[PDB]
Amino acid sequence: SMEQVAMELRLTELTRLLRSVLDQLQDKDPARIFAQPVSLKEVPDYLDHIKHPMDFATMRKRLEAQGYKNLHEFEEDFDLIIDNCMKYNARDTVFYRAAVRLRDQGGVVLRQARREVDSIG
């Protein structure tokens, strides 16, 4: 149908907008702490601690399969990256601190993305 196409154009444009948001969030992680999944070879107990692992490469795969239906789903995944880190790692670690800084800096980007998604529909 023509409607299914219209819908697919909106998803594609949402994907376009989320790709830009993703790039902006990932720039706030210059150390690349959150770039890839935590290695289960190197942290063999990880899944005993963290039930839903997440990272930027995994979000990117979902993004490019147009797997985010709305901004809320995408924020859920970004929040997992931060919250997983803040649980697994202690307060006095470079990892925990990297997550706090990502959260704080990401807030600004995500605030305007919400406005852009409501605005453009």
**3-class SS at 26?**
helix
Torsion over CA of 86, 88, 89 and 94, rounded to 10 degrees?
-70
Tell me, in Å, the resolution of the deposited structure: 1.7
Residues 6 or more apart from 116 whose CB is under 8 A from it?
A: 17
**3-class SS at 49?**
helix
User: Is the distance from CB of 88 to CB of 46 less than 8 angstroms?
Assistant: yes
Chosen CATH of 1-121 out of 3.40.50.1370, 2.40.50.140, 3.30.200.20, 1.20.920.10: 1.20.920.10
Question: What is the token pair recorded at 17?
Answer: 């907008």
Residue whose entry in the numeric block shows the structure tokens 């790709």: 19
Residues 6 or more apart from 24 whose CB is under 8 A from it?
A: 109
Breaks (C-N over 2.5 A) in the chain follow: none
Report the alpha-carbon distance of residue 24 to residue 13 in Å, rounded: 17
Listed residue (92, 97, 67, 93) closest to 82, CA to CA: 97
